Amino acid sequence: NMVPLNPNRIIPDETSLFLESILLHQIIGADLSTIEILNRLKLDYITEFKFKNFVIAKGAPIGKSIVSLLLRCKKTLTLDRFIDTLLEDIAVLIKEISVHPNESKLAVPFLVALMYQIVQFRPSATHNLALKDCFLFICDLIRIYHHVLKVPIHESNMNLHVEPQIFQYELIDYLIISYSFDLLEGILRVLQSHPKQTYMEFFDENILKSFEFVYKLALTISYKPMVNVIFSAVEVVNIITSIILNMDNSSDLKSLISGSWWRDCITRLYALLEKEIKSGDVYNENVDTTTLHMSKYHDFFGLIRNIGDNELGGLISKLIYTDRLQSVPRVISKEDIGFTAPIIGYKMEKWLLKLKDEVLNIFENLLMIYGDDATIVNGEMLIHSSKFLSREQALMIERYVGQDSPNLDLRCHLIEHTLTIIYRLWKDHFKQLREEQIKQVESQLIMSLWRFLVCQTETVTANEREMRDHRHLVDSLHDLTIKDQASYYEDAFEDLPEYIEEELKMQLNKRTGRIMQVKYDEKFQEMARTILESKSFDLTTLEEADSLYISMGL
Amino acid sequence: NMVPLNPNRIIPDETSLFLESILLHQIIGADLSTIEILNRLKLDYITEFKFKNFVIAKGAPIGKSIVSLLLRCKKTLTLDRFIDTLLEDIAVLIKEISVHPNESKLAVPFLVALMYQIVQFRPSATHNLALKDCFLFICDLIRIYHHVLKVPIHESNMNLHVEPQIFQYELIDYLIISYSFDLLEGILRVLQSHPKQTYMEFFDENILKSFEFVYKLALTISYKPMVNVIFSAVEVVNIITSIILNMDNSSDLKSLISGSWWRDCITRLYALLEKEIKSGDVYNENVDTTTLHMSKYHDFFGLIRNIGDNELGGLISKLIYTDRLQSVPRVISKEDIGFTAPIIGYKMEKWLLKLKDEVLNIFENLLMIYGDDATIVNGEMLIHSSKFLSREQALMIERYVGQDSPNLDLRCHLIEHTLTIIYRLWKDHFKQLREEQIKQVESQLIMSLWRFLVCQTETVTANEREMRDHRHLVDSLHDLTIKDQASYYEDAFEDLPEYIEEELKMQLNKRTGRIMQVKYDEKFQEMARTILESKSFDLTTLEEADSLYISMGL
Amino acid sequence: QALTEVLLGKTELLKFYDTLKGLYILLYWFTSEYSTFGNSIAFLDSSLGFTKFDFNFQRLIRIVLYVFDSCELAALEYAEIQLKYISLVVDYVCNRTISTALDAPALVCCEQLKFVLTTMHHFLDNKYGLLDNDPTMAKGILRLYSLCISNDFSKCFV
């Protein structure tokens, strides 16, 4: 009854698979593979490079030197030694390509994306000290590429837009910055995949200091923000707080952490969360720090997620002449880019709603870190989260219910989740919640609770019949979604046995009610009830609470 | 007592090893790897090529299209399917690069050498129908590249050597022809390595017809012979006759063979063997058809053997501009090539002596094929082999004993082996040996036998003492050889226990006697005795034989 | 043929040993130079450093590499017989050189060079052949580097 083994198990050579994946690695949008674009590269200022038998001549094909290193170290090293050999060698390559005044850095984005593909292929064998070395290299690499995330808010009155309208250097260093932060995110997720005993090798003070500088560089205040790198920079902090939660020896990590790092992160998180998401001025350039707007001149996918349309895709291919060995960039006139469909705006809104979800998610995570009170568990997550909850309910009701965009459901899931972020902060963390700050938010908290307490009346739904008319009114988009899923992409969605479309005509209807802002879930109504009704704080008196009960009836 | 197995036997991926060997494959002499030189290749006349998803654009990097095919078929095929996929695809590539008037064929030598590396890597998996297809492709490929081996014997009186002194097209097609014949040799040795039941899949009439044409093209008569392709062409016939000997069903092969193919091969073999080997005019250009002279304008190594000095290897590197994508060749002025050491001449003599050894070796082989008599077992291997034996004894004694070149021992091993070629032809094949042709060679046969029967006197050696003085006189070069072997390159040649240099003070002495033309081996003396003394034919009468016995004494 | 049933593990111990040893000596006879074995034997029939024994030997050496990866034995005598085959693989490629007067003996087949180089490299990569006061692998490495001092094959060595 024992299953018989395979006598000729062909375990594939994992470094051969890794090498082949390197060689055929191509980013999404460009014509040629990344290695081949590197073959189309030289460097006519560094007339010789060598670090460890990694000789690059003056007019040498750079990717040819790469593949020399690749094929050489393939015969020699095992997997992790091959990896970190490539990591440190291409790191030193990126290093002295960077630190030179006259040198163009066109190889650098492809080198960073190449190195990302190197890292993320097998995280099981990728070594954490190599992660640390590469990580600190990307951190001080971004403080080298310094002036990108520090373009000022407004131009001068005489800051002329007369210009050669060039885009090649801008494309180079936008890809450098974006791929760099993407690589930081990749390092930390593969370091997350490394086990829950093995972090102190990665973590020391220099990790936190370098990331603290580049984090203030990323979530900027007096400069134009790059929404791309904002995604990465907050996903980093997500991975950080996640592994702090999921290790046993969180004490060494939090003792390494100074609370200045916390309270400098949390202010930029608040200033991020107090921004707005409006489709009609995403791809417009507008007032700063209110509109996460994803500028037209940096619009591609990225290494992890495919964040935009990648209008710059063929422009990555036209960065090079593809019939020639060069280092200077091929031309991109800047304004040739650029009315068909604002679905681009809707999916960019979908990304930004997932972003604010991640912001309140890491708020949740850090509260679960500091179950105890601290400098940062201090009450401002009543204020800022309550402001967010109140605004994304009020102008939800004013603006969104009946706007039939696909983003309505996630935008009203934001309030559904930050209700619990209010709730467990209220119940389990009342000890720090100061008497002054609750009065700083006394209107909006109680009103936001009452916007769920008004939903216990239940005089809209009461049936099945008219509710599906209402979801024809507002939720035809999810009807399209579920017909496409039921028709193509789900095994269980065919030949429905008259118990599961029963579940459908329960859940689509409660979902479209949750869109229509009446008839939330009773547990969320109870969570809003057991803060306002709760006598932990005098939110209302009894002679003021009935003034709100009459505003339902009751 | 059973040895334990290995639970994690890492069988390497053999196609990964094969692919890596392709990618790092570099010919001996050029700077870059072969694939990397192919990366510097385009073709601006065939504006698009495609055979089986093998799209090549106009200015496309050709080796990039190769490595696209390589990495694509790596993930899909097993080893033999990967091989013959590459074989037919690069074959079609070579095909339409050839059949075009305006097209330069610079990719073709590297494609042929690449294909050779493809074939010879694993002969165990390489399939014989693919060998047949590739083989016929190389045969009609050489009849395409027709005029190379058909440059006339002499130039005209007004055939001016005013010329642009270009060498690049000459280098291209000399490498094409030479690598082509080298590939033919490789196909037939890997086909030899294929087992002794599996030849009829390879062999049909078209094999023999195509090779018969290219063989008459190779061992030319009215044209200037390239010695390189003569080596390959006779090694082909060696492999042919060898597998004819080493199969059981030789009858189907010899029934496929018409005797015209034999008697057209054997005439060119006779005309080859009736040439001379002289060091002082190897690298001179001289009278034809007597001096296998290995012309200066084709002097490189080749794919199997390293036949020359490879003066042209740096010129193979300088065939391309290496910083540029091109198809036209980089410049080689023809006479920049070209006093230190005629050791180059001595080693080229060593090659040519091995060549004539191979000629008489395949004579031996075909006699052992036709133990029975035929059109070609017909007596002319008394005449031509006896002429060779007599001349390489006579001017051996006149010219060589005391010339202290390293080639003396093999030049007098030629006579030692063609003595047996005479001998077993005499003993076992007397039935066809006509009464007329023995009188055509009556002088030289009996005189050649007498030059061994003079060595039964034994009045030079008789001791040890003076013989080592004689090997100081003529055999100091083998003393250098055996001191280098005794000092570096033999395990058994240290701490000699007084039984093994006892072998040396016999064998160096019999070797230097065999050089000094007195005191051959007694078995060779007996073989020369049992032809002349033998009454199978009246070579001498008894009253004429004593006239030769008195010329020793006796 | 008997080499293959040590894969299935039912092989003996001394019969294993002298099967490997008899394989080794049958290799060693045919790895000799052209002067010892001439054209008397039908796979050494071809001259010019280029025999039928070439590719069959390159087959069987990969077969015994596969057998050595198949077996798992750290015996002292197994290390002793393990050094023997790398001695044989350097002796196979030394004697087919042209063997001139005082210059380094130039090879004939760069493929046979690459075969012995990659063979002893794959040998060393798997921690194979370790024994006390034994200069055999050192001799092989030094002889092949002496072949590849400064010729065109030095890049082939590296």
mmCIF file of C-alpha atoms in Angstrom, chain B residues 41-278:
data_model
loop_
_atom_site.group_PDB
_atom_site.id
_atom_site.type_symbol
_atom_site.label_atom_id
_atom_site.label_comp_id
_atom_site.label_asym_id
_atom_site.label_seq_id
_atom_site.Cartn_x
_atom_site.Cartn_y
_atom_site.Cartn_z
ATOM 1 C CA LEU B 41 25.743 39.775 -36.940
ATOM 2 C CA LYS B 42 22.843 41.036 -39.037
ATOM 3 C CA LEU B 43 21.753 40.503 -42.664
ATOM 4 C CA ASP B 44 20.575 43.533 -44.637
ATOM 5 C CA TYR B 45 19.522 41.707 -47.805
ATOM 6 C CA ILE B 46 17.209 39.024 -46.480
ATOM 7 C CA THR B 47 14.855 41.530 -44.902
ATOM 8 C CA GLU B 48 12.947 38.810 -43.054
ATOM 9 C CA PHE B 49 13.661 35.198 -42.295
ATOM 10 C CA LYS B 50 11.377 32.656 -40.661
ATOM 11 C CA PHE B 51 11.277 28.875 -40.876
ATOM 12 C CA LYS B 52 9.598 27.491 -37.722
ATOM 13 C CA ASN B 53 8.975 30.383 -35.252
ATOM 14 C CA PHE B 54 12.554 31.462 -35.964
ATOM 15 C CA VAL B 55 11.778 35.036 -36.938
ATOM 16 C CA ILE B 56 14.818 37.062 -37.936
ATOM 17 C CA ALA B 57 14.215 40.677 -38.859
ATOM 18 C CA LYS B 58 16.332 42.713 -41.256
ATOM 19 C CA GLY B 59 18.759 44.366 -38.863
ATOM 20 C CA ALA B 60 18.110 41.786 -36.186
ATOM 21 C CA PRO B 61 20.914 40.329 -34.058
ATOM 22 C CA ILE B 62 21.243 36.849 -35.474
ATOM 23 C CA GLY B 63 22.684 35.188 -32.384
ATOM 24 C CA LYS B 64 19.919 36.857 -30.405
ATOM 25 C CA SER B 65 17.469 34.984 -32.613
ATOM 26 C CA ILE B 66 19.556 31.846 -31.982
ATOM 27 C CA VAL B 67 19.389 32.275 -28.225
ATOM 28 C CA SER B 68 15.661 32.957 -28.463
ATOM 29 C CA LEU B 69 15.356 29.581 -30.197
ATOM 30 C CA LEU B 70 17.716 28.042 -27.643
ATOM 31 C CA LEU B 71 15.884 29.204 -24.551
ATOM 32 C CA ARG B 72 12.517 28.494 -26.149
ATOM 33 C CA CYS B 73 13.308 24.925 -27.106
ATOM 34 C CA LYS B 74 15.110 24.337 -23.787
ATOM 35 C CA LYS B 75 11.863 24.562 -21.833
ATOM 36 C CA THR B 76 10.044 22.315 -24.307
ATOM 37 C CA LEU B 77 12.084 19.590 -25.917
ATOM 38 C CA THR B 78 14.138 16.716 -24.618
ATOM 39 C CA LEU B 79 17.758 16.357 -25.679
ATOM 40 C CA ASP B 80 17.608 14.793 -29.151
ATOM 41 C CA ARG B 81 14.622 16.880 -30.198
ATOM 42 C CA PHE B 82 16.471 19.977 -29.006
ATOM 43 C CA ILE B 83 19.524 18.880 -31.007
ATOM 44 C CA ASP B 84 17.856 18.163 -34.322
ATOM 45 C CA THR B 85 15.614 21.194 -33.926
ATOM 46 C CA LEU B 86 18.781 23.282 -33.784
ATOM 47 C CA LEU B 87 20.291 21.214 -36.602
ATOM 48 C CA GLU B 88 17.495 21.733 -39.103
ATOM 49 C CA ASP B 89 16.868 25.349 -38.082
ATOM 50 C CA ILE B 90 20.475 26.476 -38.344
ATOM 51 C CA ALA B 91 20.708 24.325 -41.484
ATOM 52 C CA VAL B 92 17.881 26.267 -43.128
ATOM 53 C CA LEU B 93 19.590 29.408 -41.833
ATOM 54 C CA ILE B 94 22.901 28.475 -43.521
ATOM 55 C CA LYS B 95 20.899 27.457 -46.596
ATOM 56 C CA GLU B 96 19.249 30.751 -47.396
ATOM 57 C CA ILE B 97 22.253 32.728 -46.230
ATOM 58 C CA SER B 98 24.117 30.778 -48.903
ATOM 59 C CA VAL B 99 21.617 30.996 -51.772
ATOM 60 C CA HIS B 100 21.641 34.745 -52.318
ATOM 61 C CA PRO B 101 23.801 36.775 -54.707
ATOM 62 C CA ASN B 102 24.369 39.994 -52.766
ATOM 63 C CA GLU B 103 24.602 38.421 -49.312
ATOM 64 C CA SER B 104 27.794 38.099 -47.315
ATOM 65 C CA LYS B 105 28.136 34.741 -45.601
ATOM 66 C CA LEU B 106 30.142 35.709 -42.532
ATOM 67 C CA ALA B 107 27.709 34.025 -40.158
ATOM 68 C CA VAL B 108 28.102 30.737 -42.033
ATOM 69 C CA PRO B 109 31.479 29.553 -40.574
ATOM 70 C CA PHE B 110 30.351 30.280 -37.042
ATOM 71 C CA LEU B 111 27.025 28.620 -37.783
ATOM 72 C CA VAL B 112 28.818 25.526 -39.058
ATOM 73 C CA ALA B 113 31.165 25.411 -36.065
ATOM 74 C CA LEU B 114 28.189 25.987 -33.783
ATOM 75 C CA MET B 115 26.373 23.110 -35.459
ATOM 76 C CA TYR B 116 29.476 20.964 -35.039
ATOM 77 C CA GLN B 117 29.503 21.694 -31.312
ATOM 78 C CA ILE B 118 25.800 20.811 -31.329
ATOM 79 C CA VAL B 119 26.463 17.443 -32.962
ATOM 80 C CA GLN B 120 29.538 16.260 -31.148
ATOM 81 C CA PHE B 121 28.430 17.071 -27.594
ATOM 82 C CA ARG B 122 26.327 13.972 -26.930
ATOM 83 C CA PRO B 123 26.667 11.461 -29.778
ATOM 84 C CA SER B 124 24.626 9.005 -27.692
ATOM 85 C CA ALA B 125 21.406 10.977 -28.100
ATOM 86 C CA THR B 126 22.134 12.519 -31.514
ATOM 87 C CA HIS B 127 19.822 10.891 -34.038
ATOM 88 C CA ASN B 128 21.078 9.330 -37.248
ATOM 89 C CA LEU B 129 18.362 10.666 -39.545
ATOM 90 C CA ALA B 130 19.307 14.117 -38.305
ATOM 91 C CA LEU B 131 22.891 13.119 -39.076
ATOM 92 C CA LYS B 132 21.791 12.150 -42.581
ATOM 93 C CA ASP B 133 19.904 15.399 -43.140
ATOM 94 C CA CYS B 134 22.754 17.521 -41.799
ATOM 95 C CA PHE B 135 25.243 15.393 -43.740
ATOM 96 C CA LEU B 136 23.508 15.824 -47.084
ATOM 97 C CA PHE B 137 23.151 19.494 -46.223
ATOM 98 C CA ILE B 138 26.887 19.817 -45.808
ATOM 99 C CA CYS B 139 27.538 17.860 -49.005
ATOM 100 C CA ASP B 140 25.325 20.006 -51.185
ATOM 101 C CA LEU B 141 26.503 23.005 -49.165
ATOM 102 C CA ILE B 142 30.011 22.337 -50.391
ATOM 103 C CA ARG B 143 28.800 21.872 -53.951
ATOM 104 C CA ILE B 144 27.228 25.303 -53.493
ATOM 105 C CA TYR B 145 30.564 26.668 -52.242
ATOM 106 C CA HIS B 146 31.995 25.244 -55.396
ATOM 107 C CA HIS B 147 34.849 27.415 -56.646
ATOM 108 C CA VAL B 148 36.978 27.251 -53.485
ATOM 109 C CA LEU B 149 38.556 23.864 -54.171
ATOM 110 C CA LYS B 150 38.609 24.684 -57.899
ATOM 111 C CA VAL B 151 41.218 27.380 -58.179
ATOM 112 C CA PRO B 152 43.473 26.343 -61.084
ATOM 113 C CA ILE B 153 46.977 24.905 -60.761
ATOM 114 C CA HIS B 154 48.794 27.895 -62.187
ATOM 115 C CA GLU B 155 47.772 31.460 -62.714
ATOM 116 C CA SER B 156 47.998 33.017 -66.153
ATOM 117 C CA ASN B 157 51.021 34.975 -67.340
ATOM 118 C CA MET B 158 48.779 38.040 -66.983
ATOM 119 C CA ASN B 159 46.890 36.872 -63.919
ATOM 120 C CA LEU B 160 48.088 39.896 -62.037
ATOM 121 C CA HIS B 161 48.690 39.885 -58.334
ATOM 122 C CA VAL B 162 47.545 43.458 -58.375
ATOM 123 C CA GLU B 163 44.575 43.079 -56.167
ATOM 124 C CA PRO B 164 43.100 44.950 -53.204
ATOM 125 C CA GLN B 165 44.967 42.266 -51.176
ATOM 126 C CA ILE B 166 41.785 41.376 -49.435
ATOM 127 C CA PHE B 167 41.608 38.321 -47.276
ATOM 128 C CA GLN B 168 38.198 38.562 -45.629
ATOM 129 C CA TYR B 169 36.063 36.750 -48.231
ATOM 130 C CA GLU B 170 38.827 34.195 -48.638
ATOM 131 C CA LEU B 171 38.862 33.730 -44.884
ATOM 132 C CA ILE B 172 35.070 33.377 -44.846
ATOM 133 C CA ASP B 173 34.837 30.648 -47.409
ATOM 134 C CA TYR B 174 38.048 28.878 -46.372
ATOM 135 C CA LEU B 175 36.524 28.593 -42.908
ATOM 136 C CA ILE B 176 33.237 27.523 -44.543
ATOM 137 C CA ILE B 177 34.886 24.731 -46.550
ATOM 138 C CA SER B 178 37.213 23.603 -43.764
ATOM 139 C CA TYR B 179 34.573 23.610 -41.040
ATOM 140 C CA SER B 180 32.213 21.877 -43.477
ATOM 141 C CA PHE B 181 34.568 18.969 -44.078
ATOM 142 C CA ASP B 182 35.377 18.933 -40.359
ATOM 143 C CA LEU B 183 31.659 18.598 -39.714
ATOM 144 C CA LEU B 184 31.451 15.734 -42.215
ATOM 145 C CA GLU B 185 34.187 13.994 -40.233
ATOM 146 C CA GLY B 186 32.304 14.715 -37.020
ATOM 147 C CA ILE B 187 29.018 13.349 -38.404
ATOM 148 C CA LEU B 188 30.717 10.181 -39.404
ATOM 149 C CA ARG B 189 32.530 9.607 -36.145
ATOM 150 C CA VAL B 190 29.353 10.158 -34.140
ATOM 151 C CA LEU B 191 27.597 7.889 -36.638
ATOM 152 C CA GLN B 192 30.394 5.412 -35.954
ATOM 153 C CA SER B 193 29.608 5.775 -32.248
ATOM 154 C CA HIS B 194 26.017 4.880 -33.076
ATOM 155 C CA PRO B 195 25.680 1.095 -32.695
ATOM 156 C CA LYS B 196 26.447 -1.680 -35.148
ATOM 157 C CA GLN B 197 22.802 -2.361 -36.005
ATOM 158 C CA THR B 198 21.696 1.141 -36.929
ATOM 159 C CA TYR B 199 23.384 2.276 -40.126
ATOM 160 C CA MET B 200 20.842 1.655 -42.908
ATOM 161 C CA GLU B 201 18.839 4.598 -41.582
ATOM 162 C CA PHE B 202 21.869 6.753 -42.343
ATOM 163 C CA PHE B 203 23.058 5.111 -45.513
ATOM 164 C CA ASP B 204 21.433 5.232 -48.918
ATOM 165 C CA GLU B 205 22.695 5.984 -52.416
ATOM 166 C CA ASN B 206 22.510 9.770 -52.066
ATOM 167 C CA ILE B 207 25.057 9.640 -49.215
ATOM 168 C CA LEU B 208 27.566 7.925 -51.485
ATOM 169 C CA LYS B 209 26.803 10.040 -54.558
ATOM 170 C CA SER B 210 27.079 13.368 -52.755
ATOM 171 C CA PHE B 211 30.250 12.302 -50.991
ATOM 172 C CA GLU B 212 31.684 10.925 -54.228
ATOM 173 C CA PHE B 213 31.234 14.301 -55.896
ATOM 174 C CA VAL B 214 32.675 16.199 -52.965
ATOM 175 C CA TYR B 215 35.525 13.686 -52.682
ATOM 176 C CA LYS B 216 36.542 14.272 -56.280
ATOM 177 C CA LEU B 217 36.140 17.962 -55.441
ATOM 178 C CA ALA B 218 38.413 17.535 -52.410
ATOM 179 C CA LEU B 219 41.305 15.344 -53.599
ATOM 180 C CA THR B 220 41.536 17.389 -56.768
ATOM 181 C CA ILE B 221 43.835 16.819 -59.722
ATOM 182 C CA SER B 222 43.643 19.869 -61.985
ATOM 183 C CA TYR B 223 43.231 22.361 -59.141
ATOM 184 C CA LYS B 224 45.136 23.638 -56.141
ATOM 185 C CA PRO B 225 44.584 21.246 -53.208
ATOM 186 C CA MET B 226 43.668 22.472 -49.755
ATOM 187 C CA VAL B 227 45.438 20.021 -47.484
ATOM 188 C CA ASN B 228 42.959 20.650 -44.640
ATOM 189 C CA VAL B 229 40.059 19.139 -46.503
ATOM 190 C CA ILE B 230 42.202 16.223 -47.677
ATOM 191 C CA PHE B 231 42.710 15.226 -44.019
ATOM 192 C CA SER B 232 38.960 15.237 -43.444
ATOM 193 C CA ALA B 233 38.100 13.527 -46.720
ATOM 194 C CA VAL B 234 40.397 10.598 -46.109
ATOM 195 C CA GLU B 235 39.283 10.337 -42.461
ATOM 196 C CA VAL B 236 35.730 10.024 -43.794
ATOM 197 C CA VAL B 237 36.737 7.039 -45.923
ATOM 198 C CA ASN B 238 38.554 5.653 -42.890
ATOM 199 C CA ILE B 239 35.342 5.793 -40.849
ATOM 200 C CA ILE B 240 33.428 4.262 -43.771
ATOM 201 C CA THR B 241 35.741 1.280 -44.209
ATOM 202 C CA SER B 242 36.038 0.914 -40.437
ATOM 203 C CA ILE B 243 32.322 0.525 -39.895
ATOM 204 C CA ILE B 244 32.133 -1.749 -42.955
ATOM 205 C CA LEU B 245 34.616 -3.945 -41.108
ATOM 206 C CA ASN B 246 32.857 -3.613 -37.753
ATOM 207 C CA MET B 247 29.287 -4.346 -38.825
ATOM 208 C CA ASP B 248 27.789 -7.761 -39.465
ATOM 209 C CA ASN B 249 25.614 -6.717 -42.427
ATOM 210 C CA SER B 250 28.366 -5.346 -44.622
ATOM 211 C CA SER B 251 26.591 -6.911 -47.614
ATOM 212 C CA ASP B 252 23.796 -4.331 -47.792
ATOM 213 C CA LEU B 253 26.334 -1.514 -47.581
ATOM 214 C CA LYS B 254 28.672 -2.971 -50.195
ATOM 215 C CA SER B 255 25.662 -3.765 -52.395
ATOM 216 C CA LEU B 256 24.655 -0.123 -52.083
ATOM 217 C CA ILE B 257 28.236 0.656 -53.111
ATOM 218 C CA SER B 258 29.074 0.605 -56.793
ATOM 219 C CA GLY B 259 32.679 -0.335 -57.530
ATOM 220 C CA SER B 260 33.044 2.914 -59.479
ATOM 221 C CA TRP B 261 33.026 4.705 -56.118
ATOM 222 C CA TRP B 262 35.912 2.479 -55.013
ATOM 223 C CA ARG B 263 38.060 2.776 -58.137
ATOM 224 C CA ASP B 264 37.496 6.524 -58.254
ATOM 225 C CA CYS B 265 38.571 6.850 -54.630
ATOM 226 C CA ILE B 266 41.640 4.626 -54.951
ATOM 227 C CA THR B 267 43.175 6.562 -57.850
ATOM 228 C CA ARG B 268 43.119 9.796 -55.863
ATOM 229 C CA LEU B 269 44.560 7.883 -52.899
ATOM 230 C CA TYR B 270 47.445 6.643 -55.073
ATOM 231 C CA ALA B 271 48.079 10.146 -56.420
ATOM 232 C CA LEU B 272 48.071 11.423 -52.844
ATOM 233 C CA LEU B 273 50.472 8.747 -51.576
ATOM 234 C CA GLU B 274 52.871 9.474 -54.445
ATOM 235 C CA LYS B 275 53.563 12.938 -53.005
ATOM 236 C CA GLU B 276 56.536 14.039 -50.928
ATOM 237 C CA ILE B 277 57.090 15.639 -47.525
ATOM 238 C CA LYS B 278 59.906 18.206 -47.295
#
